[PDB]
Design a protein around this nucleic acid. Structure first.
Ligand SMILES: [Mg+2]
Ligand SMILES: [Mg+2]
Lengths: 190, 189
DNA sequence: TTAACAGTCACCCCCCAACTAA
DNA sequence: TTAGTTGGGGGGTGACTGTTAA
DNA sequence: TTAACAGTCACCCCCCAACTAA
DNA sequence: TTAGTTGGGGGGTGACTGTTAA
């Protein structure tokens, strides 16, 4: 909101060149992957004479002066609630990024999945079957049938969830052992 | 601060017992460490019959109903800016705790200080002599003097800065080997 | 370090809810 | 308490390939 | 997982600014 | 950029001893 309307920083010399060169590179090489294009765009930039590189840098320097003005004026007109709101959206964005990043790291390290409850096994073995014109609607049907489920049938799912608790404790022991060895005792359950 | 005036959740049964016992234990054992008293308080709690622990738990349950009311009333009168401020205050406190925890740990583990620059070694030797009756004011007089320092005499501090940098590397090497024994690649790069 | 550009991909997050380890 | 787990549609995003500089 | 109580200790934080590795 | 480093005054706080439960 306040962060969305906040002036952004100008784009440095190379990225200006890249932004403009990517479409003309993509047009001439349609089935070439973007990584391949950027590799060559970067080459062209490094092979570009400094008389021309400078032109892109001068544009950036002049834009930096517009930005310095725009951000100063923007921050002067912000009320205390808007300043704290801006600070809160920045930190909230930063924490979601940092969370997502650590969830990706833990997945690459091969961290075991947490235990699947008796309800989770019911969702797994009874989702796609149940009526519903949407996944949200299908979960409500599964939840309604989970409540209506007899105590004899609940014991079928309680058992599967008991076997998954055993598999979590065994998998966590090996993973945690492995993590001590890889020098990552910080990841262990305290 | 919205958070400061925010009703706090009731203390659970053990902590109620602790709050009341600590003064009695402290009076009867004046030269005992608080840690030693809490250890004994925790044992008296463990040893307390469940008929008596249930009394402390009933107080808590009844107190939880007062809290549910007080927090509901409090949140209804909060403004969108105050709601957003409270949420920010809670998260800010949480992050400061997590930062401090990592700073204390590194200090516990004996992590060395980073390398200090020519400007740092300059304010380390001449801060005393600097004019001012406040640390903030008298540090300001060394900045305008750091600028007015000729580059020839400024070179005298950059040699002594690198003298310290070599010491930092030797301490860092010893600490990092002692940390791979703890088993923490998380603390290295 | 990391945000600043972009096309494609493959992975994560939100929501619906319930359950439960940390 | 939070967060992650079952399901997936329909959004959102870091890594990849690069350089610059705040 | 962490907030909820407390006494003591040995730090840490935040301000003023400049400088600089990551 | 951020964060940490030089200085310290003037407050703030996690570890330590513990259990409960949101
Ligand atoms: Mg997303
Ligand atoms: Mg990139």
């Amino acid at each position: 909101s306040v962060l969305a309307s906040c002036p952004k920083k100008p784009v440095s010399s190379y990225l200006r060149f890249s932004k403009e060169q990517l479409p003309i590179f993509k047009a001439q090489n349609p089935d070439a992957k973007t990584t391949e294009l950027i590799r060559r765009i970067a080459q062209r930039w490094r092979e570009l004479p400094d008389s021309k590189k400078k032109i892109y840098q001068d544009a950036y320097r002049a834009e930096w002066q517009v930005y310095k003005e725009e951000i100063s004026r923007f921050k002067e007109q912000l009320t205390p609630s808007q300043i704290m709101s801006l600070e809160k959206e920045i930190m909230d964005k930063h924490l979601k990024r940092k969370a997502m990043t650590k969830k990706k790291e833990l997945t690459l390290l091969g961290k075991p999945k947490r235990p699947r409850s008796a309800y989770n096994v019911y969702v797994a073995e009874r989702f796609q079957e149940a009526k519903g014109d949407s996944p949200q609607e299908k979960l409500k049907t599964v939840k309604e049938n989970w409540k209506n489920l007899s105590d004899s049938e609940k014991e079928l799912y309680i058992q599967h969830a008991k076997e998954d608790e055993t598999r979590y404790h065994n998998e966590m022991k090996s993973w945690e052992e492995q993590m001590i060895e890889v020098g990552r005792k910080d990841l262990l359950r305290r």
